[PDB]
Amino acid sequence: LTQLISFLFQCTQWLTTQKWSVSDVFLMTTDNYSTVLTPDIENLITTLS
Amino acid sequence: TIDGQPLSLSLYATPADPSMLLSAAITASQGGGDLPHAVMPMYRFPVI
């Protein structure tokens, strides 16, 4: 419990030091991303092909 | 009070904060150039 509390505290401190949001870290670190075919992904496909 | 002014002070509600405006650059993806039909010319390789 106190390990979880200390982890959440120092993660919030590093977050507000880096001036990011929880949404920003969730974007950079998530694993539940989409499966839709983005136009950027299409441009990557046709460029790399 | 005796003069009608209230003893207990009023509530001061908090005003709404100014929001941060967001923009975005949506992107497109058009097809590439496909190769036409090749024709054989009459000249040799360095000329062509």
Alpha-carbon distance of A4 to A7, in angstroms, equals 5
Q: Which residues of A14-31 are buried (b: 16+ CB within 10 A; e: fewer)?
A: eeeeeeeeeeeeeeeeee
Q: What is the resolution of this structure in A?
A: 3.7
Nearest CA among A36, A31, A42, A28 for reference residue B30: A42
Does residue B14 sit at the A interface (CB-CB below 8 Å)? no
| Experimental determination approach used | cryo-EM
Q: Which residues on chain B are in Cβ contact (under 8 Å) with A21?
A: none
Alpha-carbon distance of B45 to B24, in angstroms, equals 51
Identify the DSSP state of A31. S
Q: Which residues on chain A are in Cβ contact (under 8 Å) with B32?
A: 46
Beta-carbon pairs below 8 A across chains A and B: 11
Alpha-carbon distance of B16 to B20, in angstroms, equals 12
Please state the φ and ψ torsions of residue B16, each to the nearest 5 degrees.
-75, 140
